[PDB]
């Protein structure tokens, strides 16, 4: 009975600590900046237009269109790089195109069968498929849904689903909200599982280059 | 030769530390309380009896029968909730019905293909399959075994196995032993991989509510 | 406006830390000990020659041939053991035959579908397949390659790939380079995921036994 009481008190302590953590995450999301360069419908339409072609040609055409419609906000050909992404038990790769304090645009996908935790969304993310399949298992339900090239899955803030991607699945991803908070989730398995310090290097490098591009465009627009 | 000696000394240090950890686990397990409300054969027969129905109807009927045969030991309908479980590389979901210092009962399953480490804890676990398949690859062997609805896999005290569950696999799980020791493994991937503080919140909340129900039943029986 | 610069400076700090980590990995792996007992071609042909038999008979004959051609460098039958290996999100099992500061030989494989990160280390790794399939997804590309019994996959120094093995895949693995640099990747999931301290016990025990056997052989050869 004494051990039961001690265990209940410890569980209550962990309960309130986790509640405070989630509350601080929600506060950071609420008080976040809302100056947006893109709209999610725009990225969704642009990615859905080229979903019928090969995914590499689609990547090329979408990058060209993004550079054409938003000059100074997309990285150059010299800065584009495929970087592994290990998070929540799954493994994929990304190619960052745009990333600021409130938005980011990248090409995400995997060439192998993988799946795991989607991560607690404290920012709004949208994925429009170009090839492969995307199986989502939302929280609270016992059934999953399948998504195909042309579909767009939007992840609201606070949602946590079970994601799964077949081999050769590739999509375009646009994130809106408090972008830095996602970094942790993007690097968790890189820190405590894969020990891939070079992947962490490449990730922070491309993010810093995207921030530098955004600041340079800001200065050139006001200067 | 010097580096080899240093590496061997470090390996011996890790060896003795891990041995002391295993010794602490076994000591806190053997000397744990053994006040049992249920027995694994009761839950096994209750789950196998309704294993032919749809897994949702089976869940409902099993919950009703548990509340009929053990009234003050099953959580209320207002306290039932599906909570994600990320551990050992695999991801699923649970709904807890009973949980004490020495026992716990829940409904566990996944709607997607998953698998990984079963985990090591001082607790005899029993899983009776309601739907789906369960592949178990025990330690020390090079071949696995498949289990179908109606079967009951018994994870013994020294269980190091590889588990795998196909999409739509649902089962009823009963565990007796040092239940808090099973918390760590159940939350490790939640801490270092998923960054899901809300799932940790839900887990500790439902465990605290189950312990509260058990303590309330105990006090109402002794008073 | 200002927080962009703040985040960029933080990313620069993380960048220099990760860069120093990678540079130290390179410098320590380079300029290391060059005492080699085996070579990847010998092990590759020894495994490919027996790749047509059942994998257990192949294991036995390969161990016998290794003890015949390199006596004193292979563990005894009393020291052989199958130990689970959780790393990078995948779960397999190993049987260590030889391990020193510069080389290691073991029998690896899995009885369940698994996959994940291969890991980065200054160590040339070669795997010759006896059964099952090995899908490798190298870094920087969007397509993977399948390998079959008889094939030998070379994990180059400093490379990072996505590995995937079907159920029943078994292979003979030979590592050359700075072996301790892999140890971290070999145990991360054991510490932050499986919490399996007995598997860690077994791993460090077999590594210490291999190092002790190597030291004994060296002393007997010079004494």
Residue numbers in the entry:
A (entry chain C), B (entry chain A), C (entry chain B): -3 to 219
What text does the study give?
The ligand binding site is located in the lumen of the β-barrel domain (β1-β10), whose opening is covered by two membrane-adjacent helices (α4/α5) at the carboxy-terminus.
Interestingly, in addition to the α4/α5-entrance and the hinge-entrance, the simulations revealed a third potential entrance located between the α4 helix (near S177 and F181) and the β4/β5 loop near R116 (termed side-entrance). Therefore, we solved structures for ~30 randomly selected xlσ1R crystals and eventually succeeded in capturing a xlσ1R structure at 2.81  Å with the side-entrance open (termed xlσ1Rside-open). Comparison of the side-open and the side-closed conformations revealed that a local conformational rearrangement of Y117 and W118 on the β4/β5 loop leads to open or close of the side-entrance. In xlσ1Rside-open, W118 of a side-open protomer (e.g. protomer C) is 4–5  Å away from Q191 and F193 (α4/α5 loop) of protomer A. Moreover, the side-entrance gives solvent immediate access to residues such as S114 (β4/β5 loop), Y117 (β4/β5 loop), D123 (β5) and H151 (β8), which are the coordinating residues for water molecules in the distal β-barrel lumen in the xlσ1Rprog-co structure. This data suggests that the side-entrance may be a potential water entrance that allows water to reach the distal region of the β-barrel lumen.
